[PDB]
Structure 1
Amino acid sequence: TYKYVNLRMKSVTDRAAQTLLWTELIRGLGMTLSYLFREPATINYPFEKGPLSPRFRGEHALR
């Protein structure tokens, strides 16, 4: 029902090498460069319009 978040020589050397050589920083930079090479979701307003619904609440009108 419940879980414990944040309750956790080779390992010490790996941690020191990560400290000196910045392994996880390189991982985060790699994910940033991954998001650089994708297709951006910018729609060309005003020549393109965002999706809507037939229930959209806009301007008042008298039928």
Structure 2
Amino acid sequence: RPATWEESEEGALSKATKYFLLAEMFRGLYVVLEQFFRAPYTIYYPFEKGPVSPRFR
């Protein structure tokens, strides 16, 4: 059975803190920002070339 509000482990103030301060949204923004400091994948065609195999048609 789904649990009701009165059987919740977290107090209402902690939940309100998560609600008003957008905790998981901030985690998502941080994950996006981490990518900004990683190496990009781009190659500079036609000066560089993607992989080609002997079977290519």
TM superposition score normalised by structure 2: 0.75
Distance 2:54 2:14 in 1: 57
Question: Where does the alignment leave 5 or more consecutive residues of structure 1 unmatched?
Answer: 1-6, 58-63
Question: Where does the alignment leave 5 or more consecutive residues of structure 2 unmatched?
Answer: none
* Aligned residues with identical type, % of pairs: 47
Distance 2:20 2:31 in 1: 20
SS at match of 2:20: helix
- Larger Cα-atom Rg: 1
The CA RMSD measured in Å over matched residues stands at 2.2
Matched residue count: 51
